[PDB]
Amino acid sequence: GSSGSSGAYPDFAPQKFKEKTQGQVKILEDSFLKSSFPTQAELDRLRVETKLSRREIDSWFSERRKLRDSMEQAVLDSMGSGKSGPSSG
């Protein structure tokens, strides 16, 4: 474990965001596979373990469901954003 939990903060990391590491994903799958919607306690262990943040995971799980739904009849919320910067994007 660590002295302090994993939390966001105002700083510039010299390393760019990398794809989800096998280990991390594996840790999440174990939880998700069991319960799509993790509990405070669960997630808490997910972030620290996978070394990710609430938002970070939020995406993984959010999408993970889409795969399970299989384009089935289910109510969902609406959202849309626009991000730019790098070339060919």
Curated annotation (Swiss-Prot):
Full-protein positions shown: 524 to 599 of 837
Coiled-coil region(s): none
Family, similarity comment: Belongs to the ZHX family.
Source organism, top-level taxon: Eukaryota
Native species: Homo sapiens (Human)
Function: Acts as a transcriptional repressor. Represses the promoter activity of the CDC25C gene stimulated by NFYA. May play a role in retinal development where it regulates the composition of bipolar cell populations, by promoting differentiation of bipolar OFF-type cells. In the brain, may promote maintenance and suppress differentiation of neural progenitor cells in the developing cortex.
Protein name, UniProt field: Zinc fingers and homeoboxes protein 2
Subcellular localization(s) per the UniProt record: Nucleus
DNA-binding region: 14-75
Subunit (UniProt): Homodimer (via homeobox domain). Heterodimer with ZHX1 (via homeobox domain 1). Heterodimer with ZHX3 (via homeobox domain 1). Heterodimerization with ZHX1 is not necessary for repressor activity. Interacts (via homeobox domain) with NFYA (via N-terminus). Interacts with EFNB1 intracellular domain peptide; the interaction enhances ZHX2 transcriptional repression activity.
Tissue specificity remark: Ubiquitously expressed. Expressed in podocytes.
